[PDB]
Design a protein around this nucleic acid. Sequence first.
RNA 1: AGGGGCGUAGUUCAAUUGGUAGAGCACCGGUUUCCAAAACCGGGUGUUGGGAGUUCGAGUCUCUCCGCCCCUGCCA
RNA 2: GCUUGACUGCGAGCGUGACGGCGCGAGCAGGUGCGAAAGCAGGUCAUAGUGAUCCGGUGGUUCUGAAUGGAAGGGCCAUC
RNA 3: UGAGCCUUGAUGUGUAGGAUAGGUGGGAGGCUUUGAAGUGUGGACGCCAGUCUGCAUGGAGCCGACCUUGAAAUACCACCCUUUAAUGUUUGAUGUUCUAACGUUGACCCGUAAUCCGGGUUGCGGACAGUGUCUGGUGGGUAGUUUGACUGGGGCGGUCU
RNA 4: GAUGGGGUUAGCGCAAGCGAAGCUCUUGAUCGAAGCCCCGGUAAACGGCGGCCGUAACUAUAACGGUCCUAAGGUAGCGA
RNA 5: CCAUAGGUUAAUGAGGCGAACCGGGGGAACUGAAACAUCUAAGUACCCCGAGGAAAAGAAAUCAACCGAGAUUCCCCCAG
Lengths: 223, 77, 149
Amino acid sequence: KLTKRMRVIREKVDATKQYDINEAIALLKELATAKFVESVDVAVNLGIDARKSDQNVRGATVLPHGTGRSVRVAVFTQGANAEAAKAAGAELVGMEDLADQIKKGEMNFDVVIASPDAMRVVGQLGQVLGPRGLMPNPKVGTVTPNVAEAVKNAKAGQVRYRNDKNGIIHTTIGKVDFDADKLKENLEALLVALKKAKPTQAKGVYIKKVSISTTMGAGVAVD
Amino acid sequence: SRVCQVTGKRPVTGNNRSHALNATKRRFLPNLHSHRFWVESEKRFVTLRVSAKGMRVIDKKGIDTVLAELRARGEKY
Amino acid sequence: MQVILLDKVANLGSLGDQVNVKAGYARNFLVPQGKAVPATKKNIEFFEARRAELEAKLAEVLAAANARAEKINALETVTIASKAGDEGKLFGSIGTRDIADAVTAAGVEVAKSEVRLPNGVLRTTGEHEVSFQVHSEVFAKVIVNVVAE
RNA sequence: AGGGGCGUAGUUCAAUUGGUAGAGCACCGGUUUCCAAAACCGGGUGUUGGGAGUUCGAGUCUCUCCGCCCCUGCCA
RNA sequence: GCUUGACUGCGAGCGUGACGGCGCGAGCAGGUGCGAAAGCAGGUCAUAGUGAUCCGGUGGUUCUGAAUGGAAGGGCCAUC
RNA sequence: UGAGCCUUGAUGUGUAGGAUAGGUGGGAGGCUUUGAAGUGUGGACGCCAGUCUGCAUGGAGCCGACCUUGAAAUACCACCCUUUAAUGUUUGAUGUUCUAACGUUGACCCGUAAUCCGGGUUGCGGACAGUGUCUGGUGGGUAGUUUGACUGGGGCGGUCU
RNA sequence: GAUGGGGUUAGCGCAAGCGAAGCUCUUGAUCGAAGCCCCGGUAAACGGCGGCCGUAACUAUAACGGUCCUAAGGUAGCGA
RNA sequence: CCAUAGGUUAAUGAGGCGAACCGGGGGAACUGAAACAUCUAAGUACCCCGAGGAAAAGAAAUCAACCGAGAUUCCCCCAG
Ligand SMILES: [Mg+2]
Ligand SMILES: [Mg+2]
Ligand SMILES: [Mg+2]
Ligand SMILES: [Mg+2]
Ligand SMILES: [Mg+2]
Ligand SMILES: [Mg+2]
Ligand SMILES: [Mg+2]
């Protein structure tokens, strides 16, 4: 049934037992076996379940190491914030014209940022940006008067996360070619932000399990 | 009467309590059982009225040693 | 309820194997039928003494085995006389009776059954190589010189 | 108190279990026969207790706002 | 229209109760609000809208802490 | 025969549609004589639409990839979620085959001039029954008590701040 | 006795504080029978055997019912 | 089958009585709480067992608190 490619992947990782961060990051570097450069895919299970409405978590985190995942930023803002966004390196800055370009199907951006005054225009794009999860939300810091900082903060390695129905976290710390020590710092910085996001009523271990995997790599548990 | 032949346990009296702590007199009796103990020296079975706690001490002390103390008290077999 | 086995009760093991077991088992079944005895400190040492004493008996018997062995192994060739076969087959055979009388006199005493005459019943006259088995592991060796009477 | 439970057409009770609330009888009509009654249909009857979420979209899942419940439980 | 005085510590002197108690109070201290200010505000036009103590719960507190350091528990304050 | 997890397999139709397209990322890939596509029933299930792959056969093909679609796919993976199936791990629930505890108000012998008792022999039952501690339920069977005051007598009615 | 919360302190810290191990206080996952809930049966078991409306050629009355409560509303016989 | 149970002798000892005091095994209710359940009465009355002129207790796994004390019993304080 299983081919030789798939059987060697599961031969390298024995996920039936837990592993420590030091060993886990070593395994991740040896799992990078693909024609194209892969990106680490986080597989963290939370004991808390989003079936309770108030227990949902939305957050954001800027990573110094970065991820490499495309970061083209479209900005909805007017006035001085439009110049500050351009000076901060935003690829697209506009309001109605850029919204109408999006309605025309020009989707050459990975991140949308909006000023609160621009929420009126971005609200009309809710049918397009909403299902894709690109809609700016204040809880993730993408709706701010400090548009230049949001453009900055993003660019490099700002990552987002939103809890699913099964209470699982599937983020990305960065590319696989990143150094083990840097990757360990990346996940550690992510992890502290999750602890802050945790509510209180949740009478369960915040994290049900922490695992890491690449595009075609196997899941190695982290302790 | 309800007296253990090894430990000497006998009925004692106490109170039945309740959620209102009402006290009514009661009796606590030992977990006595008639058992036939195999004594190797006489190659015989001797029946004793023993409590469940007495059974535990018989293994620890030995069948001969416990009987020796009973003979000091003095009784029939 | 620690108890020292006296036999191979079920799967508990074999003779001489202290094992933890539920009180009832020994308190009323193993002991009153004689299949075991409590392994109490006193009893266990005595049984362990029985273990080492039979080991010493095994030692002593095998020790005295090598004694007899060497006594007769190193040379200790015997000479027997029978009616000359006239340059060839020495007429009659020599059997359990006379190979045992030879050793009796010359020292070590061996049973006719013990005697191991491999090369038939040693009918021809000449040098003959005869072994003895004093003990199951002892492989003794003797040279016999047959001479005419 | 705590753990299970239930509130859908005037009559009750099914369900769906995110995508899609019928039947019951009462009523008015229509069929059916030579005619009546019985039967057979059409049709007029709904916010799934209520409120807010979750959601592309939930009477359905959740939080619950409650009434009415069964089990269970505590010394101002 | 603007606001939180439906303020905190207190309180001269009175009222009404056998008592437990209940009621009224200028003024003082600290911080407020509305007024440009004088000033007014310690809930509501007033008189009903209520329940002692014990026991237990919650928060606060350098008060206590059974040899000593803690702690438990208790006390005080807030409060059920 | 239970209830568990562990792993593995399988399971994911409102619809548009590629349609047996869970959940969420990763993901432009995918992918591979090591059985390319295939071709033959291994298919069993299932919506009977489809799905996974006895294995044999053939030898590089295979496939992210429109449109609608929540929507982009059992093409891509961690591994999980539901439906679960098998598999590994644990307490128990009965049934049975036992005897050795225990039971015998079965038989026989003795103590023994004895329908008691004890001991022995034997049979039957048997890890039950039965008893102790703890515990839920039941319990006028038996107890200890309560069951107000005002009031044109009392009760009834009314009243109690 | 799963898990969680506290107390204590070896130690680390200028000290703020943190806190190993152990002991200890507590939270109570999992297991758990009868009973109760539930499903039936049983009245020579304890017990129960009403109202409402319409309907016979004068009326009346209601068999013939219908309706509600209810579980079901008194038969034979007897009856101031 | 030995044995054991049992049986027959012979030696000793105990039997009962008696006031209170003492130790131990059991152990009320009236009453008080202005009722009455916890509680009180009360381990009292009473019953039973045993002992002595006394009995019982008794030679620190006791207290203290960083100073120390040094078996038990009894009295006065501590102290309502
Ligand atoms: Mg001859
Ligand atoms: Mg006003
Ligand atoms: Mg009384
Ligand atoms: Mg009166
Ligand atoms: Mg008359
Ligand atoms: Mg009284
Ligand atoms: Mg005297």
